[PDB]
Design an enzyme around this catalytic site. Structure first.
Site, PDB file in Angstrom:
ATOM      1  CG  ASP A 145      -5.810  -0.959  15.823  1.00 33.04           C
ATOM      2  OD1 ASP A 145      -6.756  -0.393  15.180  1.00 33.04           O
ATOM      3  OD2 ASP A 145      -4.798  -0.345  16.190  1.00 33.04           O
ATOM      4  CD  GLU A 161      -2.298   4.213  12.708  1.00 31.71           C
ATOM      5  OE1 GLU A 161      -3.097   3.802  11.836  1.00 31.71           O
ATOM      6  OE2 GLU A 161      -2.621   5.054  13.545  1.00 31.71           O
ATOM      7  CD  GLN A 187      -1.103  -0.576   3.706  1.00 24.92           C
ATOM      8  OE1 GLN A 187      -2.300  -0.279   3.769  1.00 24.92           O
ATOM      9  NE2 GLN A 187      -0.504  -1.322   4.630  1.00 24.92           N
ATOM     10  CG  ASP A 237      -2.626 -13.874   8.791  1.00 24.58           C
ATOM     11  OD1 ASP A 237      -3.640 -13.172   9.096  1.00 24.58           O
ATOM     12  OD2 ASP A 237      -2.674 -15.118   8.854  1.00 24.58           O
ATOM     13  CB  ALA A 238      -3.327 -11.274  13.307  1.00 24.24           C
TER      14      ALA A 238
HETATM   15  N1  TER Z   1     -11.409   7.884   7.078  1.00 26.55           N
HETATM   16  C1  TER Z   1     -12.629   7.268   7.524  1.00 26.55           C
HETATM   17  C2  TER Z   1     -12.331   6.688   8.883  1.00 26.55           C
HETATM   18  C3  TER Z   1     -11.631   5.341   8.791  1.00 26.55           C
HETATM   19  C4  TER Z   1     -11.075   5.037  10.165  1.00 26.55           C
HETATM   20  N2  TER Z   1     -10.666   3.663  10.358  1.00 26.55           N
HETATM   21  C5  TER Z   1     -10.407   3.251  11.724  1.00 26.55           C
HETATM   22  C6  TER Z   1      -9.930   1.813  11.863  1.00 26.55           C
HETATM   23  C7  TER Z   1      -8.433   1.817  12.087  1.00 26.55           C
HETATM   24  N3  TER Z   1      -7.799   0.555  11.791  1.00 26.55           N
HETATM   25  C8  TER Z   1      -6.356   0.568  11.678  1.00 26.55           C
HETATM   26  C9  TER Z   1      -5.777  -0.650  10.991  1.00 26.55           C
HETATM   27  C10 TER Z   1      -4.290  -0.750  11.282  1.00 26.55           C
HETATM   28  N4  TER Z   1      -3.795  -2.024  10.794  1.00 26.55           N
HETATM   29 CL    CL Z   2       0.092  -0.291  17.716  1.00 27.59          CL
END
Ligand code: TER
Ligand code: CL
Ligand code: TER
Ligand code: TER
Ligand code: TER
Ligand code: CL
Ligand code: CL
Ligand code: CL
Lengths: 291, 292, 291, 292
Positions: free
Chosen positions: A155, A86, A31, A137-138
């Site tokens: 997450d 993150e 990505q 992969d989890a």
């Molecule tokens: N921009 C619209 C909002 C989208 C927000 N998404 C929140 C879920 C976050 N997931 C993080 C995945 C990290 N591997």
């Molecule tokens: Cl994290």
């Protein structure tokens, strides 16, 4: 008014932020990665043109994702994060005084390296001796190790958006892979997508209903994240009750979490877990099961 | 999808809806008026380029604005609306079987007449014999008559130092004009602007604090409105207590309101009235008071 | 500032017009049809999300497309239009006093019917006894009738944009289908896409060079159309010279065209056909031939 | 493609470029300054949110602004620029071997210094010993010295009643300040705003007419600049004739200008100076004159 980041948050709805700069870019095989410096929300991490988190309000998402699950556990010591990347979920987990191990398991090492370089807020977290970063992969990672966890934190990306993460929301995954990795008394929490009065039916209601098939106790809850242009949702699940008062939550936050939370107190959690009439009824009537 | 309605929520934030059509566009000397047919939110009423009401979710704003006030009242018969104009506030008020009279006091007759014709959801409401439409400044209207009301509803534009609504949010207005025209047990409710984690400081906290200077019991509450791209707020104010449980509210709704609410049950109101940590503390510490 | 029509005129360039209304919509099997009432350019015909013509400046395009070809002919009596559809090319042709037959050949009858209903400007044209509307592919229609024409007008989509029209720009089409349908002394003109200092290389230079392979005399020319966000191009081609002075063009316009042109006089045409240094050199160096 | 630079050409028209990066953003008390790296047009200089120059096509504006004036002059040695600032006008002037001195007179030293550092295309120009940069109002600068020039170049913002450039487009400025500082055979050229079929009436026709009140020979001309989304205009003015053929212009270019022009040959200029029917007639009939 000159420069803008635009995202189509659904087919007929666009959200645009004014820009100060385009701070850093990257890509992995998986990505395209961008850190934008936005006027309304500060530094914003964008993955394949989808906002992930923004500086001004990611604390809401990460506090809501992490603290209720740990606070409802009598003594959470180890935690596995499916996804993350993150550093912010790990950051919030590492504030708990009971925690001695955090595993962050995310498939994309370049995103993790990008964030360790550029998300200043998580420098301490990424250097904490309790954190292990696993690039996998989890599902494969849970399956391949015998360790069980007091808390597991989902997450990951929303399920309907593609293939890789979808498997990590199925009844069969929960039943046969995830539960066997929870210790006795363990708590699972997952982010569960948009939780707006209408947007909640895309995935939040389905995640809730899927977890209801597997765990004895399930608590959905939600909160507004301004940069996401919606209410966002999470679901707690456990085979032990998930029932603490606002007062008990507050006492626990004071006892167990270093420094003051910015978003969440006990009353905030009680509010978050009290969904509106329409949302509650919709969650009640939901029949779809990832499966 | 080539056609878009765009609104600058803030100078640095834009919220855009794909458009099916532009059903009408026009203006009074107060404001331009447009009814859009939008894909995500249906028909949308826009005043001076600011979205007021969308078809898919206006029920949230209007149920939140109206029901908590009337339900906390023991038997509300006579209500005065400052503003409104669209008919939706009136519509929700008229669902209450206790109600004998609603006065809608709006400064812009062209908005009223536009909505009476084009917002078919409110046609019943507009034709209800209990409704009186008065075209006037609400301060002038209230001051000029001795009639008092069980509930007074603020459904005006957000306050802006130097705009025509601003005076209807001041301490002196509330103390010297509005409070004298509330009956015993009377409840005031106003819309109170954005109520987001950061956006709440522009007016919601100020409105709360201004009301805290005048009335004994002041209950701020909020709810998400998708078409608004924010949490929105309202504030209840009374000199009689405002403390009902979820279940007592549901009982009152069942007894008093015609048909089922779409958004609001008692648990919803209790959730709405429990603000988050940061917003609660920000409201508590607010010192701004709207004056004259 | 509320409502906007947005078009991506290239991948990295967007042109947006404020809207008064969305006047009429339609579709055929071939394409979605919209008449927008735009603030900057008036009523705008949009086909599959691409602007075709705008009320305020379509006269420029249609005057430039039609008048130079006819004016350079000693006595043009019949004309065949490949495409058209809107009625505007026919409208301009029907202003010539020498013309006794115009054929408009376009594949999409619903577009023609839409325009006859809603493009007020062309009501007189669509009712003129000299106009015949043929619903067919122009190649099939030229091939299937023996009639030859004094002028043939290409008013089709740009070639590179898809398949159907592309064939109507090839060296083989020009040589073996189009020329046999031109009378002795006949003139061909085609719209030839964007003709900007850089945009001209997409198709204008190729159309020019392709015609150069087939006709003895070829005259490219161009003009700004504000609603198109670019200079637009056309190419005249004939086996007889295409050389008139501004003064002779003016005399001819007065003698042969009913009412006054709005855009084009003799000097305007001379300017239009005097391309800039870079464009002229690029047309000279062009080697691509549709073929 | 998620990041865009947007410019409102008119209140009802927007022109948007996909963005690679924002290279710099800043401001003097005169204006904000930004250098953008855009996909369609390369690096773009923006002043107060208005595009000034894009990398891919600024050569068109600067060759059109500079060369026709100098080429119509018999031997231009000394030139004064009102404005400029970016260095591009100076760059094109310094291509002329006849030139001994160029004075660039710009009010905003921060723009000059920004461009001297960031517009590397102009680094040679800025370091040329023939160039003098003066930070001043051009009217004050011209009036305060008796030096006269072979060509004076207006490279200022479009006139706007009440802006700081406006005075440099008035009849009295041209007659009483500028003309006295042109040498025998002197040629004035100014940029003259949009020159589209309709857009030309905002300032191009006015500038033309104002100059027609002061100088005997006035030659308006125009050319498309893709990044500007319009035809742009310029006007030559002199008390000596301005009538050279395409070929004489090409001869002069070959003799006098270092390297080949990218945009302008003689035929191009003749084409540029032949306006369309409507624009020609609109210019002819224009009565507006910029005054004081
Ligand atoms: N921009 C619209 C909002 C989208 C927000 N998404 C929140 C879920 C976050 N997931 C993080 C995945 C990290 N591997
Ligand atoms: Cl994290
Ligand atoms: N800024 C986008 C949303 C704004 C919505 N406004 C809600 C308050 C409605 N008040 C208007 C009352 C009638 N004039
Ligand atoms: N919107 C960008 C400008 C596109 C303009 N195209 C002009 C060519 C018109 N061709 C009409 C085809 C009718 N069959
Ligand atoms: N409106 C979009 C294009 C505007 C371009 N302007 C060209 C004239 C340049 N003049 C600025 C002179 C230096 N201050
Ligand atoms: Cl109302
Ligand atoms: Cl036609
Ligand atoms: Cl310069």
């Amino acid at each position: 008014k000159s420069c803008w980041y635009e995202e189509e948050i659904e087919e007929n709805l666009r959200w645009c932020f004014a820009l100060n700069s385009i701070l850093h870019t990257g890509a992995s095989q998986y990505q395209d990665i961008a850190l934008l410096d936005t006027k309304p929300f500060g530094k914003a991490l964008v993955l394949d043109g989808k906002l992930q988190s923004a500086e001004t309000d990611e604390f809401i998402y990460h506090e809501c994702l992490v603290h209720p699950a740990l606070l409802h556990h009598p003594m959470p010591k180890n935690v596995f994060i499916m996804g993350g990347g993150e550093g912010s979920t790990a950051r919030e987990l590492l504030r708990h005084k009971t925690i001695d191990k955090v595993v962050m398991c995310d498939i994309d090492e370049e995103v993790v390296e990008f964030c360790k370089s550029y998300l200043v807020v998580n420098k301490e977290a990424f250097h904490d001796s309790r954190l292990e970063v696993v690039i996998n992969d989890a599902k494969a990672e849970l399956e391949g190790k015998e360790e069980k966890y007091d808390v597991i934190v989902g997450d990951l990306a929303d399920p309907i958006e593609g293939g890789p993460c979808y498997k990590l929301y199925t009844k069969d995954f929960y039943e046969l892979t995830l539960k066997p990795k929870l210790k006795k008394g363990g708590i699972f929490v997952t982010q569960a997508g948009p939780a707006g009065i209408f947007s909640h039916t895309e995935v939040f209601s389905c995640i809730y209903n899927t977890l209801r098939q597997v765990f004895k106790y399930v608590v959905p809850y939600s909160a507004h994240i301004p940069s996401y242009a919606d209410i966002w949702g999470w679901v707690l699940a456990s085979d032990s009750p998930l029932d603490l008062s606002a007062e008990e939550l507050d006492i626990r936050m004071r006892q167990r979490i270093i420094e003051e939370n910015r978003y969440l107190d006990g009353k905030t959690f009680v509010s978050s877990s009290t969904l509106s009439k329409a949302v509650r009824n919709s969650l009640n009537n939901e029949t779809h099961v990832y499966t």
